[PDB]
Subunit: 401 residues, 4 copies
């Protein structure tokens, strides 16, 4: 059996598992993790090849669905999360589509939250219904809407919490109880919080999906994703789509991302603490009307955040205090005055970034769509990196004034 | 515009285009092609960000659907093929699934050849019909069967020629005429032949798909794919699925494969010549019942091969002279005796490889499914690489005797 | 001019420059740093090629002595350290040999401390004297020996502080004062401390050398090094040796190392605090005779450590309390009982490591030379990484007990 | 023993060795060669660490002086060349300096040809003499000049053949005889010719050095070098300098180069034949006064080239038929009129390149020194790649006319 990882002592913590969990060392006894850039494998005999295709031996067969470097990434993340099983993908969106596709054929039914990442909303509203799926949307923060949608038989439920940019929350445990009553499996997209700040499995969720592109990489280099869940689910319908539709993670990208996992704990710790300080600063500034951050007392669901998350995260959203007449122009002026923070759409990088949601991601849905979620022309979003917290505050203060 | 590549002089040949086509050099004037390992991009102002997101400027936005290193690979392949447009993918199977997914929603109709790569068969017969597609199979070599299937309105047609592993041929110009009369778009998988030996666009084909994993890489290092076709098709339904379901090619993999394209011409030429000699050797050997190779005069469709191919390829298939009930035992005996050729399930590598399809690549079909395409327990497939031709003939002669 | 980097706002801290200092973005405006795998460059005209070779333009010419990715690593490290100029090398030993060779021809004079890294001692005692250099050794902690050796004109002075494994110190300001009166340039090897815990330039050191292989990488992946000093020295005798003897840094390694520099601050902070706790735990343990760690108040040179260092570092040395005739057996027993920490001779990794110096680190010098410095068969050295401090203490306590 | 490579069948040809020589597959049985990006190694026990440091086991210890991936490159090149031993380096100039330095201390004597690569001349005339070496230069093509210089007991002899750009030759067999009678060791730099067109070891040469940056890579991507000679030389004085001065090859670079070795045979074959055709074209053009290429019958040393080389190489030198006082102006016009070939100083790339030696390659010589070797302002050098030969001839013809 060639896939058994190096054993760790009983009871080690999340940080230890990030540094050395899941390792598969060769006979050369290299300290750091090897990179197997190969698409295929060789066999000692024809009988061994037959047995490998049958599943009687765990010999590697083809990198589209199994590679020794990819195996290290999958096991390390599985142990950090506390999941039964895991499967790596080419991107975060490949993880979302394939996880849902594994649950939903033509004639099946999906109930989802409306406040989603742009591409996740397109998968749920257009792409899967073109293949015969029935999709119903609800406001994620309204349990009576969830209950109404789930009183007919349902195959799957999908949501993100917190949402982006408005940072609205879903009550995880309450929604999972309702979902199970209707026969559905619950898929949670956990990119905003990371596995350090929010754990869905102890709250009854069936499947958790990640983007590796964001905090896991941590430095903006490559793309990747992962699907996490039950052994039966991962080895069954998920494996089948992965093998035959081929949205496969590169062994090079796996190497980058498994090395990113070693410093995840300390990077999230520092950025969470920095974002908390920055939200408090913005909350006292005379040029600012309101701030949204889950661990700030002004948040409408502050009390729920304190029970289901261990920190607020690495993103702060806020509105400028000016007439709506000049709000777009004022927001543009603020972005253009930054000297340290870069103007960019991404999240989860060591470099700090700023964006104007209303004219980028949410420009499609138009004025009516935006006003329904409270997203005005004066709203700005900042993604907090690893720069000195006082250097960041100085750049923001100068940009506002 | 940042995306216009360095123009080559008029009338330059395929070899020249493979070495220097599609380049986009930076201000540093590097001779060799740069690798942009980034997931996102920055903007000079909030206005430029808004316009870029709207597609009003050609500034890069997010690497899941556009990256400067991926663009060099796409353009280089487009020019070698003679196609209107191209989109890179995570694997050859992601190119197959996504190309057909862009043409077929629930309620649409596909006519396909039966003689296919294992995973392509699974896509056509199980995966797409689960999402509501109606699939009809035919024997690719029977034009009267094509005629009967295409006598009603049809959305898509799919086939490989020559087929993997039986090397059955499909008359491209003739099937295309029938498909267009039914309103269908024709997708050709051109992996076995490569762009050097067979060109489908001059014969009326609408879409060509490739696996980068095979001859394009040439040395068995990484996975990749491509979809080639109309600007309307590539930029429309193809781009929608790519952006939102995310089976994205890594910028690292793109670098490996675009460098592989520089040597494709000379590598195919050498391996085509070597395969032809090996096929002639096998055709005279006492232990061999038959040989299938398109440029051997003994091939049942030799005349059609001469019509639509400039060479036979790099793979040789043969059957052992042994009754069917004990043929597996004899095949295993032969493969186990090889000392230079590796036992492996792959092709298109500089290293020569051998496999037994009935117990590996086509095990899933079952005894009845294999019988329908003529694939018995006595069949053996050899992929020919760059080693000395007489060294390879020596290893095979010894293994058979 | 193509080599001018993106300038940062006035007054930014060491943490901020490590994240985004020294970047040179292309016209594609990529967020993350690009990798230019090229050996050569091209020119728009013959006149430009002539000017470029004559050094009248700053256009790149050949990667053995200048490359755009290598320049980003050089400038980021130069910004962190506060040096006038920098040059990257293939390894730390390449930095040591080339820096000293730049100052020392046949007939020139070197004064060096005796307590050095194995390979550094071989360079000073054997390799340079074979080429005509006069080398005199002193005990690093004895200022009266420094005074006597530096009472005649001298070209170079070389030492490490703290030393490895006994962690003896050299008084930087006092030795620098004596060296300058003799006309000599002071070369400090600062690998043990890192630029985060000890800074030589404000104390009047002329040259600082680094191995990138250790804390700079931080995860045990690649080799590299650097030389930092005055503009005339780096561009003069150093440049000459680098161009023509060619111990060049690879652009791939340069990308690995520059991204490592982004997390250096938080990695060193955490490992230093962890090592302080481990030193205190060992100091109080009944199986332990003595501990050596510079920020432990019992260190014989504690007041000097507090004067020139801001933390003790990430390595802890100790001796077992047992009779010397059985100490080797006892040391081997302890190493063999570790179940989390790996047995290995390396330093500066996120993975914690343990070694026995008398049979590894300091094998060459024989038993008489080891006794001279107090390095008995009962001495053990631990390199502290990023695992949970409680999990590491548990592993050490089980191994001792 | 972990270092013994997979031996190939007896008597296999050079093409087969290039594809498969020197591999060391892991227990995962990867088809393609693995990349070990590690600086250090771990041990099973303290007793294994001790024996590994003592050289009693061949267990890897530290990547500055041994790594599994670097070993595959070393062994594959050694087998192609037919040498007793091999050691990889950071660049070709590192191979030159380290090979000579291992033979030459203060007081030792070197006899070298004058017509050397620029950096090679600096090593011999300035760098080594600064460290106490006596160096004497001769005209490489004059055997009596060799004979006089070698009547004094000598330690080392160094030369290149053919020279660049004038392509004069040295008689390998004759010079080697004269050197051995002086007790000297012969170092041949074989970069211009490659291992495939000229073999030094059968003619009594003691040491051969290579730059991997040129034809070995073949695509202009990375730097590297190698030293080949007797086992006791490689494991003695060479190893000592490599371990302690550290001009180390990166494991990433070693993967690039070992894979380029698989296609070396067919790439050299195609480029050599192409250059032959191009030399013949130029030799008949009305704008051209003369041509230098070793396999052109009108070369002044044609008979010698036929005796010691199997082809002329991939570089073509020529001079314009114009008055000397306008020659620089005319040459500049020709370079600036090219539309396919790039203006660049490099060699051995699949991309074809053009250079003007008098203002680049040989700038640091002055009018006086260029006249001595016949290098006028009208001389142009072309490096031939893998583009279609008739596409290259078309560009050159238009540029001349």
């Amino acid at each position: 059996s060639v896939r058994t990882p190096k054993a760790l002592p009983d009871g080690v913590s999340q940080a230890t598992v990030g540094v050395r969990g899941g390792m598969l060392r060769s006979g050369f006894e290299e300290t750091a993790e090897a990179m197997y850039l190969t698409s295929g494998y060789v066999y000692g005999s024809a009988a061994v090849a037959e047995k490998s295709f049958a599943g009687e031996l765990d010999h590697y067969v083809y990198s589209r669905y199994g590679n020794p470097t990819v195996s290290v990434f999958e096991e390390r993340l599985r142990l950090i999360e506390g999941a039964p099983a895991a499967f790596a993908t080419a991107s975060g969106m490949a993880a979302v589509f394939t996880s849902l596709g594994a649950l939903l054929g033509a004639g099946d039914r999906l109930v989802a939250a409306r406040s989603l990442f742009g591409s996740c909303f397109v998968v749920c509203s257009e792409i899967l219904p073109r293949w015969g799926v029935q999709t119903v949307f609800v406001d994620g923060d309204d349990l009576s809407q969830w209950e109404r949608a789930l009183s007919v038989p349902t195959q799957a439920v999908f949501f993100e919490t917190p949402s982006n940019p408005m940072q609205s929350l879903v009550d995880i445990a309450a929604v999972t109880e309702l979902a199970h009553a209707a026969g559905a499996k619950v898929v949670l997209d956990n990119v905003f919080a990371t596995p350090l700040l929010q754990q869905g499995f102890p709250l009854g969720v069936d499947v958790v999906v990640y983007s590796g592109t964001k905090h896991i990489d941590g430095q903006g280099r490559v793309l990747g994703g992962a699907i996490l869940g039950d052994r039966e689910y991962i080895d069954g319908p998920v494996q089948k789509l992965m093998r035959h539709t081929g949205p496969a993670m590169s062994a090079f990208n796996a190497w980058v991302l498994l090395k990113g996992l070693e410093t995840l704990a300390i990077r999230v710790q520092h950025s969470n603490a920095s974002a908390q300080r920055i939200a408090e600063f913005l909350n006292g500034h005379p040029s600012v009307r309101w701030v949204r951050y889950p661990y700030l007392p002004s948040h409408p669901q502050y009390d729920l955040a304190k029970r289901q998350m261990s920190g607020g995260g690495t993103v702060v959203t806020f509105a400028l205090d000016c007439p709506e007449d000049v709000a777009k122009q004022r927001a543009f002026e603020v972005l253009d005055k930054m000297r340290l923070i870069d103007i960019s759409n991404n999240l989860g990088d060591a470099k700090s970034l700023v964006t104007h949601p209303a004219t980028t991601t949410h420009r499609a849905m138009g004025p009516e769509g935006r006003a329904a979620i409270g997203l005005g022309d004066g709203v700005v979003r900042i993604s907090v990196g690893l720069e000195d917290t006082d250097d960041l505050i100085a750049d923001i203060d100068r940009a506002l004034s």
